[PDB]
Write a protein that binds this ligand. Structure first.
Ligand SMILES: CS(=O)(=O)NCCCNCc1ccc(-c2ccccc2)c(Cl)c1
Length: 326
């Protein structure tokens, strides 16, 4: 038979009921601006096919962020531009302000609202249980919103979450891997960053949905409340599944792959082994006990499930008792 088909439990047909103009990014008409309105200040980082810079919009003396894209694949740039335009104004979503080209080098660049990020390697051991609840809820607002718009982010991780702690401002960034969800579509599993990859990706189950972002969110929450970064520390994509199996156990892994009739890659034969299901309390230690609670453990247990259909949706997650104090 092949693998059993699957579809999202929420926002299943949002793109189906919309015109082609919304989701057909290949037909989208991009109108470039003039990069002369912007003066580059400093480098903020470097990605696989992008260099991010802090800049000045000289026409109003306002700070902006400029992402210069290595134009490796045109279809992918068009996809990101369309999704960004589509999501513009959503809660906690980076705002694409302009799209410009270097008049001379002709390289594409995306211009965004400036976010004053506070350091990730400093924003730790000062953060409280309340702060973790607060920021997790702000990320869920972003996720429920983009999922409601028929988009899955597919690269949820701490590097893609910008926080201005002084102003308690959060922005979900880097929509370069984002995609339109269409029920029954088979997607490329070479998405997300290793530590944040959902079991569906590691077993090569192509018919995934929004729930993939919910696995990634669980990995970020686990690393935050247990002070273990990353939580699942795989050295490769095959080893990544083994690290998950050391926590969730091999019994539920076999239940998952049987339910979807997934063929497990021969490379897992000699590395998977047998593992018991671990209790979440096993990860509580003196360094992290002030951040852990029965509510946090119950919430995590509902996100970190092999079965992508059994994971909380972003809206069910926002209703969880872990967020009653927010
Ligand atoms: C250089 S750049 O483009 O600004 N990127 C760099 C991003 C820096 N990340 C900052 C970050 C992201 C997430 C969380 C987090 C908060 C609550 C729950 C889970 C995670 C924290 Cl503490 C810090």
């Amino acid at each position: 038979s092949g693998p059993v088909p699957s579809r999202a439990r929420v926002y299943t047909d949002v793109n189906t009921h919309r015109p082609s103009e919304y989701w057909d990014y290949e037909s989208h008409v991009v109108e470039w601006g003039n990069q002369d309105d912007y003066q580059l200040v400093r480098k903020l980082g470097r990605g696989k096919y992008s260099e991010v810079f802090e800049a000045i919009n000289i026409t109003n003396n306002e700070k902006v962020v400029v992402k210069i894209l290595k134009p490796v694949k045109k279809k992918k740039i068009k996809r990101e531009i369309k999704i960004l335009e589509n999501l513009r104004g959503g809660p906690n979503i980076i705002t694409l302000a302009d799209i410009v080209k270097d008049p001379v080098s002709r390289t594409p660049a995306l211009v965004f609202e400036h976010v004053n990020n506070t350091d990730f390697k400093q924003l730790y051991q000062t953060l409280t249980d309340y702060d973790i609840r607060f920021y997790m809820y702000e990320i869920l607002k972003a996720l429920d919103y983009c999922h409601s718009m028929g988009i899955m982010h597919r690269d949820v991780k701490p590097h893609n979450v910008m926080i201005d702690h002084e102003h308690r401002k959060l922005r979900l960034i880097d929509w370069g891997l984002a995609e339109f969800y269409h029920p029954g579509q088979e997607y490329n599993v070479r998405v997300a960053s290793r530590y944040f990859k959902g079991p569906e990706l590691l077993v090569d189950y192509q018919m995934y949905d929004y729930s993939l972002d919910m696995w990634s969110l669980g990995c970020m929450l686990a690393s935050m409340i247990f002070r273990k970064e990353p939580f699942f520390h795989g050295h490769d994509n095959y080893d990544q599944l083994v690290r998950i199996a050391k926590v969730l156990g091999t019994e539920d892994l076999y239940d998952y792959i049987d339910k979807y009739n997934i063929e497990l890659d021969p490379r897992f034969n000699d590395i998977l082994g047998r593992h018991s299901r671990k209790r979440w309390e096993r990860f509580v230690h003196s360094e992290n006990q002030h951040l852990v609670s029965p509510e946090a453990l119950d919430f995590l247990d509902k996100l970190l499930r092999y079965d992508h259909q059994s994971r909380l949706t972003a809206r069910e997650a926002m209703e969880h008792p872990y967020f009653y104090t927010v």
